[PDB]
Write a protein that binds this DNA or RNA. Structure first.
Ligand SMILES: *OCCCN1/C(=C/C=C/C=C/C2=[N+](CCCO)c3ccccc3C2(C)C)C(C)(C)c2ccccc21
Ligand SMILES: [Cl-]
Length: 759
DNA sequence: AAAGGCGCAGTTCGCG
DNA sequence: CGCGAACTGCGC
C-alpha cells in the first residue's frame, strides 16, 4: 500500500521517495529517473532554441532547460501543440518559469505549479491507500502549564499521554498514583521517553486533535529549550511544518500525521469543536473536561492530580477511538482522489475535485488550464442565479409528503453534457440549450467532466450492489465508504464550476445547472398543483413538501405515489423524483425555516434557531418545547405556558450558565473586522491577553447584566461564575427566548408582550 | 456523513 | 426613530 511520496536531493539530482507498507513491513522505494517539466505554447516552433538559451539562478547556480520535446495535446478538447520543457531539478521551475513566460515567443505556459511529489503520483498513475494493508496507529496528547497572558511555549509540558488499541498511558514528571501513569524526573526526560515510546511502537499513523496547530508547535518550542532533537520521523527527522492557506499543518516523514481536527471540522456541524463536544457528538458517551486553571492549580501543589491524569489519559484514548473511526473514510477518499491521506484529509471538496481532474487530465492527455492570476480572478467576481425557493404557506399543516430529486445537479451535468469544453461549440449536430441563461452544450461528444461524472455514478452503482449482495460485514463497511466517497466527489463538481480559483472554472456551466434545476423543480410543482389537487406547502431547490388539505394519511400517500408514476416519465431519465417520507404534522415559518413530525413521533427541524449555534441553549430548547407542543399534539396554549415559566425562571436568575452560552465563529483576522459585534468584542479582549485567535475560532460568550452596547457586557463562557456575575436576564428574555418563540407563536396571534412575566 | 456554490432569516451597531 | 451595512449560519 502506498502511503505518501516526497523527494530529496542527492548530488544536485532529485530522488523520489515512495513510502509504502507492504506485508507488514515499511518500505522506501527510490526513483532517480523522474524529470520535472512544464509546457510552453510558442508562436513559431523555430523559437524553441532561444527559449532553451534562457537561464535563471538558484542559490547562485545557473538553471537551464535540460531538454525540450514538441508534444500533441488536447486543450478543452481542442487539439493543441505545445513544447514540453524538462529540467534537472524541480526547484528549477519556480526559478525560471517567469522569465520563460516573459519571452516574446511564448504565448503562455502550463502545469508549472504541480508539486513534484504529486506530479509523480499522477504521471506514474500510482494510487495511495490501495489494498487491505493493516496500519498501526498511535494517538497522543499533551497537557501544558498555563497562566494568564503568557507567551506561547514558555510554560512547560506537564504530561504527554498516548494510546493505541492495547493501552492508554500517561508520562509525567510528578508522582501520581495511577496504574497507567509513568513517572519520570523532568520535562526533558518525559519528552525523551515519549520519543522512545513512538520509536518503539513505530506507528504508521500518528493521530492528534489539533496537533497541526498546537501539539507539534508546543513540543517544538519545548524541545528547543531543553536541547532535544525532536525525532519522530521513520527516517530520523523532526516533524516538518507545511503551510496550508493561512493555517499551518505538520508532516512527520514516513508516517501519516492524521490530525482529526480539520477532518471533524469539515465533516460534522457542531456549536463547539472541543474534544469533549466531538466525542459526545460521535459516541454518545460524555467526556469530562478539566480546565487549564485546574490543571495549573493541581501542578503547583500536587493536589487533585489524579483527576488531571485521568483527563490526560482520556484525551489520548478518546483521540485514538475517533481516529480509528474517521480514518477509513479518509483513506477511501484518498484512494479515490489519488493523493496522500495527509493532503486529502486537510482539503476542501474543491481541492479534491481539482486533484481528481488533474489526474484524469493526465490519463486522457488533456492539458490543464492554469490557476487564475490576480487580473483574471477579478473578471470572475460576478455571481449568478441559484436554486429556486418557494415562499411557504405559513402555519400548521396535516399529512405532508416530502418528494425530492436525488443528485439533481450531477444528473443535470451528465444529461445535458454541461462542460466547459462542450460549451458553445460550433458546427455541432445536436445541442442542449439551458433555459433562461441560454448556454449551448454540444451533445456530439461526452464532455470532460460529464464523462468522468458518468463513470463515477456507474462505479458507485456497482459498489452499492456489491455492498448489498455481500454477507461479509467488513467488506460491506468498506464498500460503504467507497460509495460514500464517490457521492461526495460527484456532488462537488457543481460547486467547483463556480469556484473562482478553479482551473476548470466555468460560470456558464454552473449557471446552466442551476437554471435547469429551477426549470425541473418548478415544473414538478406546477404538475402536482394542476394535474393532482395537491397544495405545495414549500419547495427548495430539489424537493418539496405537499399535501391535500381535506385528505387523510392514506389518501395523501396513495395520491403522492401515483403522481410519481405520472411525473417521472416526463422527466429526463436520470432525473427521478422520489418519495422521501410522510409527516403527520408540519409547521413552516419562513423560507429555510420549518419543522415536521413523522408517524413515530420523531421531529425534524430545519433552519430554525433550534439548529443554530449563535442562539443560546435556553432559547433553542424552549423553542423546541414550543414546537413539540404544537407538533406532537395540537396545544398552542401549552406552548404559551411553556414560555411563561421559562421567562419567569430567567427573570429570577435560576437558569444555569450552561444554557446561556452563545457561539459565534471568527471568520477573519481581527484587524480586518469593520463592525464589532459582541463575539468580536470578546475575541478582541482575549487576543489582548495573549490568547491566539485565528479565523475559524469559535467564541463562546455570556451576556452579563448591565446595559447599552452588547459587546461590552459579554464575557467568555468559561469565565462566568455566579459568585461574581449576574447574567442579563433582560437580554436572554428579550433578545433570546421571546424573539425565538415569537417566530412560531406570532402565527397564532401572540405578541411579545403577552408572553412575558413583567411587564 | 456536500457545499471555496447561491438563497435566505436574522442580530448588532452606528448612522442621519 | 428608522434604516442599512456588517456579519453569521443555516438549507439546499
Ligand atoms: O455525522 C456525524 C458523525 C457520524 N459518523 C460516525 C459515527 C459513529 C457513531 C457511533 C456510535 C455509537 N453509538 C451511539 C449511537 C447513537 O445513535 C453507540 C451506542 C452504544 C454502543 C455502541 C455505540 C457506537 C460507538 C457504535 C463515523 C462512522 C465515525 C463517521 C465517519 C465519517 C463521517 C461521519 C461519521
Ligand atoms: Cl489557462
Amino acid at each position: 500500500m502506498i502511503l505518501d511520496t516526497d523527494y530529496i536531493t542527492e548530488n544536485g539530482k532529485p530522488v523520489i521517495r515512495v513510502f509504502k507498507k507492504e506485508n507488514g513491513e515499511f518500505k522506501i522505494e527510490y526513483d532517480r529517473t523522474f524529470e520535472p517539466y512544464f509546457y510552453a505554447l510558442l508562436k513559431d516552433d523555430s523559437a524553441i532554441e532561444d527559449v532553451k538559451k534562457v537561464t535563471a539562478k538558484r542559490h547562485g547556480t545557473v538553471v537551464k532547460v535540460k531538454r525540450a520535446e514538441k508534444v500533441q495535446k488536447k486543450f478543452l478538447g481542442r487539439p493543441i501543440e505545445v513544447w514540453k520543457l524538462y529540467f534537472n531539478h524541480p526547484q528549477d521551475v519556480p526559478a525560471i518559469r517567469d522569465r520563460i513566460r516573459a519571452h516574446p515567443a511564448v504565448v503562455d505556459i502550463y502545469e508549472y505549479d504541480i508539486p513534484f511529489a504529486k506530479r509523480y503520483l499522477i504521471d506514474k498513475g500510482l494510487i495511495p491507500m490501495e489494498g487491505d494493508e493493516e496500519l498501526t496507529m498511535l494517538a497522543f496528547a499533551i497537557a501544558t502549564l498555563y497562566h494568564e497572558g503568557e507567551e506561547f511555549g514558555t510554560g512547560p509540558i506537564l504530561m504527554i499521554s498516548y494510546a493505541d488499541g492495547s493501552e492508554a498511558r500517561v508520562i509525567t514528571w510528578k508522582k501520581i498514583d495511577l496504574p497507567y501513569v509513568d513517572v519520570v524526573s523532568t520535562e526533558k526526560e518525559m519528552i525523551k521517553r515519549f520519543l522512545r515510546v513512538v520509536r518503539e511502537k513505530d506507528p504508521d499513523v500518528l493521530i492528534t486533535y489539533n496537533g497541526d496547530n498546537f501539539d507539534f508547535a508546543y513540543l517544538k518550542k519545548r524541545c528547543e529549550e531543553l536541547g532535544i532533537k525532536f525525532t519522530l520521523g521513520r527516517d530520523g527527522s523532526e516533524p516538518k511544518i507545511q503551510r496550508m492557506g493561512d493555517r499551518f499543518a505538520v508532516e512527520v516523514k514516513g508516517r501519516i500525521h492524521f490530525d482529526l481536527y480539520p477532518v471533524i471540522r469539515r465533516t460534522i456541524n457542531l456549536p463547539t469543536y472541543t474534544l469533549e463536544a466531538v466525542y459526545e457528538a460521535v459516541f454518545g458517551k460524555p467526556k469530562e473536561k478539566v480546565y487549564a486553571e485546574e490543571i495549573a492549580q493541581a501542578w503547583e501543589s500536587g493536589e487533585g492530580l489524579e483527576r488531571v491524569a485521568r483527563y490526560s489519559m482520556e484525551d489520548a484514548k478518546v483521540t485514538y477511538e475517533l481516529g480509528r473511526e474517521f480514518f477509513p473514510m479518509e483513506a477511501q477518499l484518498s484512494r479515490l482522489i489519488g493523493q496522500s491521506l495527509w493532503d486529502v484529509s486537510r482539503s476542501s471538496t474543491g481541492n479534491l475535485v481539482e486533484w481528481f481532474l488533474l489526474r484524469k487530465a493526465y490519463k486522457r492527455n488533456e492539458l490543464a488550464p492554469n490557476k487564475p492570476d490576480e487580473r483574471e480572478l477579478a473578471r470572475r467576481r460576478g455571481g449568478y442565479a441559484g436554486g429556486y425557493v418557494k415562499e411557504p404557506e405559513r402555519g400548521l399543516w396535516d399529512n405532508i409528503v416530502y418528494l425530492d430529486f436525488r443528485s439533481l445537479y450531477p444528473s443535470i451535468i451528465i444529461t445535458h453534457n454541461v462542460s466547459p469544453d462542450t460549451l458553445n461549440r460550433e458546427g455541432c449536430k445536436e445541442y442542449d440549450v439551458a433555459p433562461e441563461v441560454g448556454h449551448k452544450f454540444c451533445k456530439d461528444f461526452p464532455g470532460f467532466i460529464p464523462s468522468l461524472l458518468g463513470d463515477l455514478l456507474e462505479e458507485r452503482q456497482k459498489i452499492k450492489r456489491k455492498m448489498k449482495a455481500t454477507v461479509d460485514p467488513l467488506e460491506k463497511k468498506l464498500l460503504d465508504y467507497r460509495q460514500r466517497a464517490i457521492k461526495i466527489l460527484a456532488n462537488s463538481f457543481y460547486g467547483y464550476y463556480g469556484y473562482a480559483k478553479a482551473r476548470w472554472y466555468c460560470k456558464e456551466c454552473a449557471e446552466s445547472v442551476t437554471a435547469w434545476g429551477r426549470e425541473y423543480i418548478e415544473m414538478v410543482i406546477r404538475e402536482l398543483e394542476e394535474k393532482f389537487g395537491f397544495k405545495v406547502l414549500y419547495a427548495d431547490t430539489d424537493g418539496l413538501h405537499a399535501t391535500i388539505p381535506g385528505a387523510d394519511a392514506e389518501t395523501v400517500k396513495k395520491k403522492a405515489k401515483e403522481f410519481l408514476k405520472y411525473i417521472n416519465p416526463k422527466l429526463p431519465g436520470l432525473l427521478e423524483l422520489e418519495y422521501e417520507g410522510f409527516y403527520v404534522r408540519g409547521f413552516f415559518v419562513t423560507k429555510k425555516k420549518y419543522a415536521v413530525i413523522d408517524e413515530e413521533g420523531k421531529i425534524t427541524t430545519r433552519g430554525l434557531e433550534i439548529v443554530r449555534r449563535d442562539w443560546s441553549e435556553i432559547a433553542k430548547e424552549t423553542q423546541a418545547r414550543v414546537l413539540e407542543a404544537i407538533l406532537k399534539h395540537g396545544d398552542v396554549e401549552e406552548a404559551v405556558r411553556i414560555v411563561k415559566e421559562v421567562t419567569e425562571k430567567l427573570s429570577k436568575y435560576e437558569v444555569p450558565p450552561e444554557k446561556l452560552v452563545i457561539h459565534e465563529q471568527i471568520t477573519r483576522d481581527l484587524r480586518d473586522y469593520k463592525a464589532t459585534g459582541p463575539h468580536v468584542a470578546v475575541a478582541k479582549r482575549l487576543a489582548a491577553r495573549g490568547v491566539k485567535i485565528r479565523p475559524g475560532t469559535v467564541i463562546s460568550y455570556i451576556v452579563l447584566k448591565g446595559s447599552g452596547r452588547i459587546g461590552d457586557r459579554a464575557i467568555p463562557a468559561d469565565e462566568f461564575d455566579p459568585t461574581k456575575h449576574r447574567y442579563d436576564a433582560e437580554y436572554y428574555i428579550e433578545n433570546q427566548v421571546l424573539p425565538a418563540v415569537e417566530r412560531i407563536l406570532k402565527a397564532f396571534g401572540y405578541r411579545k408582550e403577552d408572553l412575558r412575566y413583567q411587564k
